[PDB]
RNA sequence: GUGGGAGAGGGUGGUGGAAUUCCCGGAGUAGCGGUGAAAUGCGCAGAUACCGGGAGGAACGCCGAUGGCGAAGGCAGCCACCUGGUCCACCCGUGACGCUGAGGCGCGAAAGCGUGGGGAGCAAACCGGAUUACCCGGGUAGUCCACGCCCUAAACGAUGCGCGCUAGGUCUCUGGGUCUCCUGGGGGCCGAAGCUAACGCGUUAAGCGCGCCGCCUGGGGAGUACGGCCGCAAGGC
């Protein structure tokens, strides 16, 4: 549709799930995947398996709009991080770089009650 | 090898001496520890504070993203 | 056993055709340690064979033992009061186990009236391809890697 | 299985304090294991038992051949209309009593709702928390005081029976048991122009207790919220009122105070 | 006094970025979220991932320390102003000007409260869900600010303050000198003599002495009753 030939991956990778977005260097969010789309309900949504189903998924359903080579960046500190990179680059695009952006808070607002007693 | 060990001579109150500052922080735009900078307290303190100071000018990044899985 | 790691005894091979897998075949028929009558019905099976089928009996034996010898099963598993069928790679010894114990248990299963022409028939029709110790190979193979989420549980 | 009593002194006690006779007519809410359902029956005229539990029913339906009077009634007592229970069962003893030893989150709303079924019965007789049964039976101006009282102030005048020991109970509470009566008084103890409007005033002056009458009044009211403006004529409507709470005050300065409401 | 030093000590203004939540757009397809496993819940009025612009409140990630400051309670972004305490050096000035302290006066975490603001996130009470026959989804006061109350704690080093004497070893923070080392002050860990019922303390004494103050006289009843004083109240002495 698109065609631009070079756009970029994002994989938030969560606790209870991870999701897989491939997006044109303009942030343009042209698809995207999901642990849940495979069809994983509940626990069995953030294992490392689904993450590699999700990458693989997502790079298909990419390469229809002929999407080659990109440049992932990734978020969340979820089990299947290093499972879904390596799906992904072992998918059959070309990936640039590999880097983390995980938001981290700067002592900002009070979290949940499980997440506290922060050291 | 400690951060100190790979300079020379340098002054810490200059919060403008940008090219030494960007050694001082890490893979990512956070300040080393003194176990990786090799200084004392007091100048781990001061080195900080400087540090601080440069990044509200801008010339220091507060974070950045680092080039790994 | 929580000490050793229990040894292997070590199988004499059958005098007919110097192969210990066929005593292990004799064995697994054995029941009620009649020796005599599992060796008769095995050789009774291997004329069916060397009638119908050309080749000598043994490569029958072994292409049908090769054929049915499984890779992936699963262990029931105890992680959070859940029972997760996880998937596991076999070794060498537990796939000939397997293998033959679940050839010899297909073959029973057969119609037929005389135990050598359920033996043969089992055999040649595994060797093929197909039967009921193939059938449970492949359910076992598929049932394992099917819920391959669980298998980060190493064990 | 909760915590079951399994003292027969205290059990023969309690059912003393219900009052249970030959005129005398038995409700049983969750009979449960059967002991107190045994000390009632046989002293009892007709005893209807309301349970929703699958098989705690049954069992002890076994045990209670020996009983003639076990009208047992496999339903859930909140779900289930009891009108009709009195019409039925209530021909042999026209008398009503409710004895109950279960665990308290179902006893207490159970409880609740009864009294707003609105079904004239003479009294009520069961088992709860002390603190629990210190903010039922409350004084003004007290720790224990809240809106708990004054919706029982209206059916009801109570006082603990006879204080639990923790022992009698198999796995042993760490607080104290303590059970109260609660015998229907004749009618409403104040009258009132809306009951439902005097439930939300006294929810209202009691939603946050610590603060002034006038500051529970300005905030917690939803029609207060309408009127926050005109609060200015709430606070004129007040009489002999000054910087009050809600503790503070009883129930005929309530019910006044609600009439008052009505007027604005 | 003079010449220097370190420090989240306090008060007043200013403003730096990363989150979180909303609003306004662009693209986006069926889930998102949650758990031990789930449900409630949100999403076809196009959710969640993601790009950009804007609003608002709260708190300061690495540095960070077993660190530092303060009489305690406590104090972490950065900048500037007004201030409190303290250490070392020169031995320069005074001549005992000192110690403690019944009442008094002042300060006093957190939670409450009155009068006005503010409300992002979290969250008493509360509305839901569910299972092990606590836990997840929402949410009020409250947590935030100004003024005025409240004066309570495992407010602990469970150790009142000041001064003098009694082996050392080791790790730190901060000074000075002639700089492998000497000499001060602060914070830890072993351990002489000694002390203790014991655990343990031990130059930061629970050792050896002196001065002053505050408390104790078996356990409940009981921090209760009465009386008094202080608070709007809860309550406090």
Known sequence: ?????????????????????????????????????????????????????????????????????????????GAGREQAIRALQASGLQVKSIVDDTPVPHNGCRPKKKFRKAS | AKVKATLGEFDLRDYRNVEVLKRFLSETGKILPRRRTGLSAKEQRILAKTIKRARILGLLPFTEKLVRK | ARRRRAEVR??????????????????????????????????????????????????????????????????????????????????????????????????????????????????????????????????????????????HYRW | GQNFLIDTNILNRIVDHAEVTEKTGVIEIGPGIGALTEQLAKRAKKVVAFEIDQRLLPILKDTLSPYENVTVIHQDVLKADVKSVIEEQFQDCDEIMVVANLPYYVTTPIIMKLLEEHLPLKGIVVMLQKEVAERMAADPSSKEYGSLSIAVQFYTEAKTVMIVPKTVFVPQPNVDSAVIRLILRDGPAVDVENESFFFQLIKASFAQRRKTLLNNLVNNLPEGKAQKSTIEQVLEETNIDGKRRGESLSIEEFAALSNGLYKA
Request: proline residues 4%.
């Open chain 1, 1 to 77: 549709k698109r065609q631009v030939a070079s756009g970029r991956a994002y994989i938030h990778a969560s606790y209870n799930n991870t999701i897989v977005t491939i997006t044109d260097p303009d942030g343009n969010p042209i698809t995207w995947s999901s642990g849940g789309v495979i069809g994983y309900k509940g626990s069995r949504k953030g294992t490392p398996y689904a993450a590699q189903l999700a990458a693989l998924d997502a790079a298909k359903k990419a390469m229809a709009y002929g999407m080659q080579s990109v440049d992932v960046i990734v978020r969340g500190t």
């Open chain 3, 10 to 151: 070590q199988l004499q091979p059958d005098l007919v055709y110097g192969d210990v897998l066929v005593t292990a075949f004799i064995n697994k028929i054995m029941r009620d340690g009649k020796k005599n009558l599992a060796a008769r019905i095995f050789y009774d099976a291997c004329k069916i064979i060397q009638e119908k089928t050309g080749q000598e009996p043994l490569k029958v034996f072994k292409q049908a033992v090769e054929n049915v010898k499984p890779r992936m099963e699963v262990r029931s598993r105890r992680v959070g009061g859940a029972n997760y069928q996880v998937p596991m790679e076999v070794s060498p010894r537990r796939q000939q186990s397997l293998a033959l114990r679940w050839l010899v248990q297909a073959a029973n299963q057969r119609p037929e009236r005389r135990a050598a022409v359920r033996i043969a028939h089992e055999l040649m029709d595994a060797a093929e391809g197909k039967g009921g110790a193939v059938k449970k190979k492949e359910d076992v193979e598929r049932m394992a890697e099917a819920n391959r989420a669980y298998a």
